Amino acid sequence: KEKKVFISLVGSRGLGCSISSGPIQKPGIFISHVKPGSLSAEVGLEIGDQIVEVNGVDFSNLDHKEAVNVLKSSRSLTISIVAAAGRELFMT
């Protein structure tokens, strides 16, 4: 289920979420623990999820550093995440 998420730094704080990289069977940008009150929680982010897009940039096979870079570059960017896209991997 392709989910949509828009992160915008309206105040002066990050999004509130982390990201991890998957194995070789399914490499990509995953979502890690998130902090409450931040934008991440406001959008409905959490561990297991998997970002498959960010401001147009396909995160299907985007490098880990690339994900953090683009996310760090633009404070406010639209990120397309798909539920279970990462949970499958987490289930180790």
Binding site: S18, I19, S20, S32
Partner: peptide, 8 residues
Amino acid sequence: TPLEITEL
């Protein structure tokens, strides 16, 4: 081993 993680 656990996968790399980053804080945003």
